[PDB]
């Protein structure tokens, strides 16, 4: 009572979002996009591992659940559920239609899928450096729930941030880094010095 995903595998249509014209879209069954120890400090989880798409296709929300649960459960079992942070980095925003014999054959909403490119991250995990084999094995287990080809790239970035590991260490053993609840805030050379003293005391030495 569900069409196989090869029917809706490829990005054949313009993106059909839930809008004021769609109005009757069933709910995405992936609803949790951060898992593990999501509240952890940027300094806690320096190593970032990425599951990256090699193909231009669509990932169903069913497949996103089925891979998220598998990677989460392998990492929870082998390494404990507070030793990793998992982020689904795609959201199923495209509505797939089904026409359930060709007069008036415009389809009603079937489901929700996520349009991915070559080189988009689907899942990102940050851990300690000693958890690398468990994370790579969890993501390679999560590969089987996704159609197409996906590579496991070790990021050269500290955590979920967008700067390199020696650059982040040069930035935090100097004074341009202060913590947020799960992410971090950086100090700039621009803005009022009264506010850049109100935050970041540890710089200007």
């Amino acid at each position: 009572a569900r069409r196989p995903a090869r029917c809706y595998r490829y990005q054949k249509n313009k993106p059909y979002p839930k809008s004021r014209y769609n109005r009757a879209v069933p709910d995405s069954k992936i609803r949790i996009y951060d898992l593990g120890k999501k509240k952890a400090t940027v300094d806690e989880f320096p190593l970032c591992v990425h599951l990256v798409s090699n193909e231009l296709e669509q990932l169903s929300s069913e497949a996103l659940e089925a891979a998220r649960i598998c990677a989460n459960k392998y990492m929870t079992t082998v390494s404990g559920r507070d030793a990793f942070h998992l982020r689904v980095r795609v959201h199923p925003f495209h509505v797939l239609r089904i026409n359930k014999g060709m007069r008036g054959a415009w389809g009603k909403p079937h489901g929700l899928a996520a349009r991915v490119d070559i080189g988009q991250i689907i899942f990102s995990v940050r851990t300690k450096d000693s958890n690398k084999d468990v994370v790579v094995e969890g993501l390679r287990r999560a590969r089987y729930k996704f159609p197409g080809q996906q590579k496991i790239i070790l990021s050269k970035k500290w955590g979920f941030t967008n700067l390199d590991r020696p650059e982040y260490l040069k930035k935090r053993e100097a004074g341009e880094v202060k913590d947020d609840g799960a992410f971090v805030k950086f100090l700039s050379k621009k803005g009022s010095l009264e506010n850049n003293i109100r935050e970041f005391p540890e710089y200007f030495a």
Binding site: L193, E194, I197, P201, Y203, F204, A205
Partner: protein, 292 residues
């Protein structure tokens, strides 16, 4: 408080003088836009502005790069014609409008023809075109932002410029003496306003009612010993002097423009440079995060 950055980025400023509150650009479009088949003919406006302590009347056309003044008359140059006090009154506006009319008609060669209403009586009149001669100078009234009300001094300036021989299109329901019942202007109140009778009757009734007000007000009148019943021939001799020599003598200029400029430069705060800004930032860093 707290204008957001999105608000600042999406904000559209009004022009400069709408921001300054000086130009109704809605009115300016209609006053400045020439008939396109009259191709380069300048459309002339009698700009009349009443600040405190001065009346400005300028005959202005518009160009691409800016407006151009044909002639200008100020109420503070009426002391050369014999009006020292009340330089923003309704009659002073009349004398300034008569002066801009005579100055413009002397600048354009239309002073022999188009004398105007030579003896001011206060009747509704338009400058008729001389047959087989030049047409009179067509000027359009620019009152700017101030309200059109019955008895306002913009129409004193209108009345004086029309009486000086300019063609200004105007109706008569905005002069003092108009009444809302019958469509008729009253020349008695119109002529008394032209010759300052509304000021003079006030001086008479204050001089018969109470003197602590009549010494606060009209003190310079008493110092120049001008009677209440003698403003009319002051204004009449002023109109004769205007019609006899309106040709704009300027002032002496009295410590010339470079000596004005060098003295007024010593009060301009000069904008700083990158070097003083970097030094200021570094010294502020030392003073604020240098551990007291």
């Amino acid at each position: 408080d707290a204008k957001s950055s999105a608000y600042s980025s999406r904000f559209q400023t009004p022009f400069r003088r709408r921001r300054e509150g000086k130009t109704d650009y809605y009115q300016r479009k209609r006053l400045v836009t020439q008939h396109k088949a009259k191709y380069n003919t300048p459309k002339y406006r009698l700009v009349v502005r009443f600040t405190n302590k001065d009346i400005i009347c300028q005959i202005i056309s518009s160009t691409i790069t800016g407006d151009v003044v044909l002639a200008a008359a100020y109420s503070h140059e009426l002391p050369r014609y014999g009006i020292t006090h009340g330089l923003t009154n309704w009659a002073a506006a009349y004398a300034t409008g008569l002066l801009i009319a005579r100055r413009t008609l002397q600048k354009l060669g239309l002073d022999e023809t188009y004398k105007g209403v030579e003896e001011v009586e206060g009747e509704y009149e338009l400058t008729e075109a001389v047959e087989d001669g030049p047409r009179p100078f067509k000027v359009f009234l620019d009152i700017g932002l101030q309200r059109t009300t019955t008895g306002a001094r913009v129409f004193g300036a209108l009345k004086g410029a029309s009486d000086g021989g300019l063609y200004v299109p105007h109706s008569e329901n905005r002069f003092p003496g108009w009444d809302f019942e019958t469509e008729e202007i009253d020349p008695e109140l119109l002529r008394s306003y032209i010759f300052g009778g509304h000021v003079s009757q006030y001086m008479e009734e204050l001089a018969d009612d109470d003197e602590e007000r009549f010494s606060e007000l009209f003190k310079g009148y008493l110092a120049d010993d001008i009677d209440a019943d003698s403003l009319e021939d002051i204004y009449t001799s002023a109109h004769e002097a205007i019609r006899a020599d309106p040709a704009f003598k300027p002032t002496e200029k009295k410590f010339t423009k470079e000596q004005y400029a060098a003295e007024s430069k010593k009060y301009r705060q000069t904008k700083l440079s990158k070097e003083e800004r970097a030094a200021r930032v570094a010294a502020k860093i030392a003073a604020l995060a240098g551990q007291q």
